[PDB]
């Protein structure tokens, strides 16, 4: 690893600087190096890991969607033949995106998940595992598509089971997990009714528990509840 010679604390420090400079590829490489030191991650460090890779893969997904739309238009009736370039370049972006997803999944498997015993860390990592399988599923078209979708589903389901037992309904990790699993149901699993039911039940159970929270926790929880509400408005 190219980060093997850098101190863990220096990698963390540089990940924070990279975030401030909006250098998310660097941020992700620093956080990968920090994970590979072999120690468990703190709450703040887990957030840095997730932010870094979400920004990297988010740019790749946006580019893939632009190219996929151009390619789909090229395959309409009446569209001129322009050669293999659109497919080739969409495939290039797709392969890079898959590589980033495989990198994140590899960090989770070696060995973040197995070492995560507290609910807050274990749910966080299992949510990430579901997310990166979901991003693989967004671009999958072959014979492994069903297994990729089931891998996302299985990780989300394990995270949900733990989150319901071990964390209050307003916990931001629990809420973000439920948000992303609902998106999985709607966008990946062809299950819009399950997506709607999960978003509604999650929102309502969080609403009923807001009275227990401080002002700052209330702000954290209601921010994610608004995302659930936004999706419910889009979907209904």
């Amino acid at each position: 690893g190219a980060m093997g010679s850098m101190e863990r604390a220096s990698l963390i420090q540089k990940a924070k600087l990279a975030e401030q400079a909006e250098r998310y590829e660097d941020m992700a490489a620093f956080m990968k190096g920090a994970v590979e030191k072999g120690e468990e991650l703190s709450n703040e460090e887990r957030n840095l890991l997730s932010v870094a890779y979400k920004n990297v893969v988010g740019g790749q997904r946006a580019a893939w969607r632009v190219l996929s739309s151009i390619e789909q238009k090229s395959n309409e009736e009446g569209s001129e033949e322009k050669g293999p370039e659109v497919r080739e370049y969409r495939e290039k972006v797709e392969t890079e995106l898959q590589g980033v997803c495989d990198t994140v999944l590899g960090l989770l498997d070696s060995h973040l998940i197995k070492e995560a015993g507290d609910a807050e860390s274990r749910v966080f990592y299992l949510k990430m595992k579901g997310d990166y399988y979901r991003y693989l599923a967004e671009v999958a078209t072959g014979d492994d598509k069903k297994r990729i979708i089931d891998s996302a589903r299985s990780a989300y389901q394990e995270a949900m089971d733990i989150s319901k037992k071990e964390m209050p309904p307003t916990n931001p990790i629990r809420l973000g997990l439920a948000l992303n699993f609902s998106v999985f149901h709607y966008e990946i699993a062809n299950s819009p009714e399950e997506a709607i039911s999960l978003a509604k039940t999650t929102f309502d159970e969080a609403m009923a528990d807001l009275h227990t929270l401080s002002e700052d926790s209330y702000k954290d929880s209601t921010l994610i509840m608004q995302l659930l509400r936004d999706n419910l408005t889009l979907w209904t």
Binding site: D131, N180, L227, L234
Partner: peptide, 7 residues
């Protein structure tokens, strides 16, 4: 595109 957990 539905909103997922970001930003």
């Amino acid at each position: 595109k539905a909103k997922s957990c970001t930003v």
